[PDB]
């Protein structure tokens, strides 16, 4: 129903830029942003197998590892109409864990870059909270965004983006239980609408 | 010396597969000159950190790894006399572009009158494991080594609470013959 499970819920995610004068008037531009009773639509995981990095830690093996209900697809309409480039994430749990979070970027389904961080829990009002705030976006991505934003046509941006995906894998560090696996696929939004997203479940 | 400084020493390093097989192992010095490897790392690149100082913290290790052979694991273990919290960062680089960065932290455990920092059984990142299988199916040691001339790992341990760098190891890689096993050579990075 949302992006997450009973063990680990994604509270918030966002990738952004603050211009170098934000020390005078603060502003931040959101490339993409998720903030968090229908059930969610489904998408068949094999239909995107080729879009993620096969052999090991790619989609098929991860799904085979399960649990099957931990897998969500997120379709992003990015706002490229806008410095410090950042990513922030916030998850929450009933149990106290140490999370490992991996972010794999893949071009044409080949694992281009991978960031991996650990995050330990901080108590809160009835919940454990895990905050990975203001991760500085790696400059592969900032460069790709700059090159991408100067293309002359939306449809060209979207054909480029059809090869660019991101796989996020959150696991328990101690036990290696997979908690959350998210495939992201990307399209650019028209000027006037901001960023927007549609979350699906990955079934088989 | 060994691999370390007065504030922090490497006691154990091992990269292994269990079905245990050890690709590389250190258990516990001539100067190599840092510019000689500048073209091997990004430019987050080694010159940045070396300028940051302290240059007595920077080391180079050359591994001759053993690929003759699951769970793919990395275990490091450090030592200190001050109670610290380490941030250990690995960066795997291929052809100078940084293709993975893995970031962990370990807080000090008291033991035998010293502090041990044990980062044991990190799942080897998936890039490295795919790389290892591909590398292993090659038919000649010289082909492995040609491949491996473009692959390097860079480790920066820093004090978490202060951001001081404490340690900085560049790793370079070749394969050894089926007879000889793993071997390695630590070097001071100077300039
Ligand atoms: O910025 C991101 C990122 C992560 C997940 C996600 F769903 C995104 F949309 C992300 N950003 C992003 C990607 C494409 C466009 I067009 C706009 C965006 F805002 N990340 C993952 C990150 O950590 C990478 C992983 C690989 C190495 C480190 N940088 C930074
Ligand atoms: C640099 C390309 C790969 C080198 C191939 C040699 C085989 C042994 C690998 C040792 C890696 C040790 C550090 C890895 C950190 C991680 O777990 O990502």
From Swiss-Prot, chain A:
**What keywords does the record list, in alphabetical order?**
Activator, DNA-binding, Nucleus, Transcription, Transcription regulation
GO terms of biological process kind: cellular response to retinoic acid; embryonic heart tube morphogenesis; embryonic organ development; hippo signaling; lateral mesoderm development; neural tube closure; notochord development; paraxial mesoderm development
Q: Does the keyword Chaperone apply?
A: no
Its subcellular locations are: Nucleus
This protein's record includes keyword tRNA-binding: no
**Chain intervals for the UniProt region annotation (Transcriptional activation):** 1-204
Q: Which GO terms describe its cellular component?
A: chromatin; cytosol; intracellular membrane-bounded organelle; nucleoplasm; nucleus; TEAD-YAP complex; transcription regulator complex
Chief subcellular location: nucleus
**GO MF, one example:** DNA-binding transcription factor activity
Q: What role is this protein assigned?
A: Transcription factor which plays a key role in the Hippo signaling pathway, a pathway involved in organ size control and tumor suppression by restricting proliferation and promoting apoptosis. The core of this pathway is composed of a kinase cascade wherein MST1/MST2, in complex with its regulatory protein SAV1, phosphorylates and activates LATS1/2 in complex with its regulatory protein MOB1, which in turn phosphorylates and inactivates YAP1 oncoprotein and WWTR1/TAZ.
What quaternary structure, including any partners, is listed in this protein's UniProt entry?
A: Interacts with YAP1 and WWTR1/TAZ.
Name by which UniProt lists this protein? Transcriptional enhancer factor TEF-4
Gene name in the database record: TEAD2
What portion of the full-length protein is represented by this chain? Answer: 221 to 446 of 447
Curated annotation (Swiss-Prot), chain B:
Q: Does the keyword Nucleus apply?
A: yes
Question: Do the record's keywords include Transport?
Answer: no
Taken from the UniProt record, the cysteine pairs bridged by disulfide bonds within this chain are: none
**Taxonomy, superkingdom:** Eukaryota
Q: Where in the cell is it found?
A: Nucleus
Q: Record's Gene Ontology CC terms?
A: chromatin; cytosol; intracellular membrane-bounded organelle; nucleoplasm; nucleus; TEAD-YAP complex; transcription regulator complex
A single GO BP term for this record reads:
embryonic organ development
Q: Which GO terms describe its molecular function?
A: disordered domain specific binding; DNA-binding transcription factor activity; DNA-binding transcription factor activity, RNA polymerase II-specific; RNA polymerase II cis-regulatory region sequence-specific DNA binding; sequence-specific double-stranded DNA binding; transcription coactivator binding
Instruction: Return the annotated region ranges for Transcriptional activation.
Output: 1-191
Recite the UniProt keywords alphabetically: Activator, DNA-binding, Nucleus, Transcription, Transcription regulation
Question: What does the function comment of this entry state?
Answer: Transcription factor which plays a key role in the Hippo signaling pathway, a pathway involved in organ size control and tumor suppression by restricting proliferation and promoting apoptosis. The core of this pathway is composed of a kinase cascade wherein MST1/MST2, in complex with its regulatory protein SAV1, phosphorylates and activates LATS1/2 in complex with its regulatory protein MOB1, which in turn phosphorylates and inactivates YAP1 oncoprotein and WWTR1/TAZ.
Subunit structure as annotated in this protein's UniProt entry: Interacts with YAP1 and WWTR1/TAZ.
The name this protein goes by in its record: Transcriptional enhancer factor TEF-4
Question: Which species is listed as the source?
Answer: Homo sapiens (Human)
Designated gene of the protein:
TEAD2
Residue numbers of the full-length protein present here: 221 to 446 of 447
């Amino acid at each position: 129903r949302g992006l997450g499970t009973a063990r680990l819920q994604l509270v918030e995610f966002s990738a952004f830029v603050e211009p170098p004068d934000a020390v005078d008037s603060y502003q931040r531009h959101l490339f993409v942003h998720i903030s968090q009773a229908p059930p969610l639509e489904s998408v068949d995981v094999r239909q995107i197998y080729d879009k993620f990095p096969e052999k090991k830690g790619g989609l098929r093996e991860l799904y085979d590892r399960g649990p099957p209900h931990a897998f969500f697809l997120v379709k992003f309409w990015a706002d490229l109409n806008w410095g410090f480039y950042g990513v922030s994430s916030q998850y929450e749990s009933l149990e106290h864990m140490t999370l490992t979070c991996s972010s794999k970027v893949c071009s044409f389904g080949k694992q281009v870059v991978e960031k991996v961080e650990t995050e330990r829990a901080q108590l809160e009002d009835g919940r454990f909270v895990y905050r990975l705030l203001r991760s500085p976006m790696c400059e592969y991505l900032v460069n790709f965004l700059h090159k991408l934003r100067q293309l002359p046509e939306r449809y060209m941006m979207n054909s480029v983006l059809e090869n660019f995906t991101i796989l996020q894998v959150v696991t328990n560090r101690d036990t290696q239980e997979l908690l959350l696996c998210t495939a992201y696929v990307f399209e650019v939004s028209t000027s006037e609408r901001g960023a927007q997203h549609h979350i699906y479940r990955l079934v088989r």
